[PDB]
Every structure is written in C-alpha cells, then in structure tokens.
Structure 1
C-alpha cells in the first residue's frame, strides 16, 4: 500500500522547523535544497522506511499499533506508536511533533507540526 521509492518535490518551512527542533545550522544550509529520497516497504502492519539526504541515511522501523523507536532528524530516538488513520494515512507524535503522512496514488504528503510551525513535504513516486 505504502511501499515504493519517492523523492521530495517541494517543502515548506524546512528552515524554520529544523531550527526549532535543533538541527545544526551546518546541516540546515546544506539540506535545505536537497530533494531527498524516501523508501518505504510495507508488509501488512509492518513498515520499514529509509530517508536519504545525500550522504545522510535514516533507517527506521515500526509495526502499526505497537511501540516503536524512531530515530529523528537530529539523531534523537524517541519511543512512540504510529497508527493508521485509514489505508492512505499514517499518523504519529514524537518530541511534541504531530506527524501525518498521506499517500494519494503516487503522491506522499508529509506534514510535521510543532506548536505553530507546520513542516510540509510533497513527494512523488520515482
């Protein structure tokens, strides 16, 4: 359902959000225009997802409904649960960030929001 390889097309408030969560500026300025590749492999409730941003690789894993440990952008790993809000939506909270991943056909739309910052990424199947 979710599986596939996707690249970012566009994103909103990368800089603002990454500062707020403590991404080191050095990595902000490099990664701000990288159109990153996300790779998803779903097997029923079981998901594995890789997020590559040049030379940075974040490999994560979770079963829906179950507790998981998600390595975040800074490197911090948080304990949380990811849930389906439908077949097309994946949904979670970590580090007070609300996260919504929406698949429509070939388009994955990810929104992360901390307080009033809404970090939105639009990715296309590749």
Structure 2
C-alpha cells in the first residue's frame, strides 16, 4: 500500500542535547530548526532511496531492504547499517549501537532516533 512518497518535516523534539551527544554545532541547528527540511522517498524494486534537503543542499542515499549496506556519514566516515521493514507502519533499522524505528503510513512518516536517553522524532506530512 505504502510505497514511495513526498513528505515535509514540520516539527522536531530535542535539539541541543541531541547535537551535543553527536557532534553538531548549536549554530547549525538554530538555522535548521527554523527551516522546514524536505524528505523524498523513492521506491524502486525493493531498492528505496532516501533524499533529504537542507537549505540548499541535497542529500541522496541508497539502501536495500533486508540487507546491510554501507552508508557514509556527514563527516565522510563509512559506517555499516542494516535497514529492514517490519510490515505495515513498522520498520526496524539499526546501525552501530543506535536504535532507529520508522513508522510508515499512507499519509504521514515518523522517524525515531534514540541516543544517550535522547529522543529525536521527525514529523512529516504527505505532499
């Protein structure tokens, strides 16, 4: 039912603690929080690509469902991660030591990132 779609972020919880625990400068977050990022999901034969645009930068990625693929970080470091779907509105993806759960709906897309007791949730609407 749910396969590929355009979604736009409208709100996020927690910033300062999330970035601090990672390595993102508060300067960049402030500018990004006031800007509604963009999210585009491309579904092509089990191969789903995730695209995120920030201000004037476009980020494109590729991953295979039920298969561990190597993705680069914002620092250029190569990390291994396995993304798998659980079915309807439920998908389980874990990398290194962080738990990421994304709920897939035919109208809204929510992402859950937990690191160091920090809760990061992205709310996006269908467009």
Q: TM-score normalised to the size of structure 1?
A: 0.87
What displacement does 1:122 show? 0.7
| Alpha-carbon separation, structure 1, partners of 2:33 and 2:20 | 12
Secondary structure of the structure 2 residue equivalent to 1:38 = strand
User: In the alignment, what sits opposite 2:43?
Assistant: 42
TM-superposition CA deviations, 1:43-85 (whole Å, max 9, x none): 2421111011112322111001112122345554411110111
User: In the alignment, what sits opposite 2:28?
Assistant: 27
User: In the alignment, what sits opposite 1:52?
Assistant: 53
Gap runs ≥5 in structure 1 = none
Going from structure 1 to structure 2, the CA distance change for 1:73 and 1:87 (only over 3 Å counts) comes to: farther
- After the TM superposition, list the runs of 4 or more consecutive aligned residues in structure 1 that deviate by more than 3 angstroms: 71-77
May I ask how many residue pairs the two structures share in their alignment? 126
More moved, 18-27 vs 65-74: 65-74
User: In the alignment, what sits opposite 1:84?
Assistant: 85
What displacement does 1:34 show? 1.6
User: In the alignment, what sits opposite 2:63?
Assistant: 62
What displacement does 1:101 show? 1.4
RMSD: 1.8
Over alpha carbons, which structure has the higher Rg?
2
Q: TM-score normalised to the size of structure 2?
A: 0.86
Gap runs ≥5 in structure 2 = none
| Alpha-carbon separation, structure 2, partners of 1:75 and 1:13 | 25
